[PDB]
Amino acid sequence: QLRYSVVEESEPGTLVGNVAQDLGLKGTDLLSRRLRLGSEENGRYFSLSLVSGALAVSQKIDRESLCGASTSCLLPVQVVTEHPLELTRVEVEILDLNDNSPSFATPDREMRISESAAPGARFPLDSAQDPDVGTNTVSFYTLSPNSHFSLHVKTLKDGKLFPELVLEQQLDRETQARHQLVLTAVDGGTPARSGTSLISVIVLDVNDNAPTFQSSVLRVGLPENTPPGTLLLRLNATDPDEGTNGQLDYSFGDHTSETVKNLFGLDPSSGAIHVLGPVDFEESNFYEIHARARDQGQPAMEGHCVIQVDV
Numbered sequence: 001q002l003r004y005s006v007v008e009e010s011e012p013g014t015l016v017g018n019v020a021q022d023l024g025l026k027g028t029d030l031l032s033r034r035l036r037l038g039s040e041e042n043g044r045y046f047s048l049s050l051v052s053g054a055l056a057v058s059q060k061i062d063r064e065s066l067c068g069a070s071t072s073c074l075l076p077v078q079v080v081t082e083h084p085l086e087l088t089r090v091e092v093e094i095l096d097l098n099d100n101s102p103s104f105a106t107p108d109r110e111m112r113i114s115e116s117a118a119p120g121a122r123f124p125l126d127s128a129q130d131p132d133v134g135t136n137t138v139s140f141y142t143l144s145p146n147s148h149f150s151l152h153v154k155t156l157k158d159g160k161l162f163p164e165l166v167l168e169q170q171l172d173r174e175t176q177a178r179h180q181l182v183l184t185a186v187d188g189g190t191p192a193r194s195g196t197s198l199i200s201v202i203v204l205d206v207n208d209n210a211p212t213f214q215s216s217v218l219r220v221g222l223p224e225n226t227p228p229g230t231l232l233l234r235l236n237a238t239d240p241d242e243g244t245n246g247q248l249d250y251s252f253g254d255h256t257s258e259t260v261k262n263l264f265g266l267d268p269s270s271g272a273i274h275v276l277g278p279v280d281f282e283e284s285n286f287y288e289i290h291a292r293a294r295d296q297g298q299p300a301m302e303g304h305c306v307i308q309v310d311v
């Protein structure tokens with residue numbers, strides 16, 4: 001019947017269409033036939049003038065509030081003229097404006113990812129929203145430049161987008177236990193509007209390290225008259241892992257000779273090796289002690305140090 005177009009968020013007084021002209025009403029016709037909007041509801045957003053006969057915007061119109069996520073916003077108004085009483089249907093289309101920015105449910109997102117996460121692992125992300133319609137809604141996502149993750153966007157169901165993290169390289173807590181990424185959602189307007197979500201990846205610890213002694217092989221010498229209680233050497237094994245995965249226990253090799261165990265005694269905690277028995281040149285000119293640094297993680301890791309004792 002009567003179709004006009006008006007831009008969303010237009011200021012009150014904005015022209016929409018000439019009702020009087022498109023109906024054949026000129027001058028006194030507007031009064032004699034009583035030009036009029038249908039009900040009080042029709043005049044909420046519009047006003048029909050008795051002077052110009054033009055349909056204008058009464059109150060600022062928000063397209064998102066009226067039609068929401070509808071494809072086309074068609075606002076029906078009722079124009080009444082008397083003698084003869086004839087009613088005219090007028091459909092005013094509310095053109096969408098790109099005045100809404102992509103929104104996330106939460107400004108920040110935390111992810112607890114294990115250090116043993118294999119490449120190809122997919123981690124879902126919160127989807128953004130843009131109440132605008134057409135190209136003005138969410139178009140694509142971007143992920144801040146990193147060295148471990150990749151961004152993949154899957155469009156499911158009705159064409160809405162669901163972003164997810166794709167692990168490219170294996171994480172390592174020993175290098176950095178945290179990664180901060182910025183998920184940015186962008187719409188397809190000109191100019192484009194965006195919104196962000198701060199993703200902080202927490203790398204959980206995994207026992208992926210074995211204890212390592214300061215030296216692979218140590219050679220020391222003690223006099224023939226070394227008294228009982230004398231410290232030979234204090235072992236030093238390091239483990240970069242967190243918590244119990246980093247704590248270690250010292251011990252001899254499982255097949256260490258009984259002679260060595262009767263002569264020497266190590267403190268499993270401090271790693272201090274003491275000579276406790278007698279030694280001469282005749283018994284043996286040398287002893288080869290096998291040290292071991294057992295981890296406390298599951299599974300347990302271990303390092304090894306061979307100590308050569310000359311006398």
Ligand SMILES: *[C@@H]1O[C@H](CO[C@@H]2O[C@@H](C)[C@@H](O)[C@@H](O)[C@@H]2O)[C@@H](O)[C@H](O)[C@H]1NC(C)=O
Pocket residue numbers: 212213214215236237238
């Ligand atoms: C124990 O060793 C710490 C680390 O030493 C380094 O790492 C080991 C695995 C070897 O490769 C060694 O050659 C390196 O220098 C030292 O930082 C630390 O001071 C040592 N002592 C104690 C009491 O921790």
Ligand SMILES: *[C@H]1O[C@H](CO)[C@@H](O)[C@H](O)[C@@H]1O
Pocket residue numbers: 184186192193194195
């Ligand atoms: C999100 O991205 C848009 C362009 O895509 C920027 O204009 C905005 O400032 C924000 O960085």
Ligand SMILES: *[C@H]1O[C@H](CO)[C@@H](O)[C@H](O)[C@@H]1O
Pocket residue numbers: 107108182195196197198
């Ligand atoms: C997304 O990220 C931007 C920049 O990282 C922040 O400024 C914003 O508040 C949101 O957290």
Ligand SMILES: [Ca+2]
Pocket residue numbers: 008009062063064099100
């Ligand atoms: Ca709006």
Ligand SMILES: [Ca+2]
Pocket residue numbers: 008063064096097098099100131132133
């Ligand atoms: Ca809009």
Ligand SMILES: [Ca+2]
Pocket residue numbers: 098099100101102130132136137138187189193
């Ligand atoms: Ca938008």
Ligand SMILES: [Ca+2]
Pocket residue numbers: 115171172173174208
């Ligand atoms: Ca690692």
Ligand SMILES: [Ca+2]
Pocket residue numbers: 115173174205206207208209240241242
């Ligand atoms: Ca680790």
Ligand SMILES: [Ca+2]
Pocket residue numbers: 207208209210211239240241245246295297301
């Ligand atoms: Ca370890």
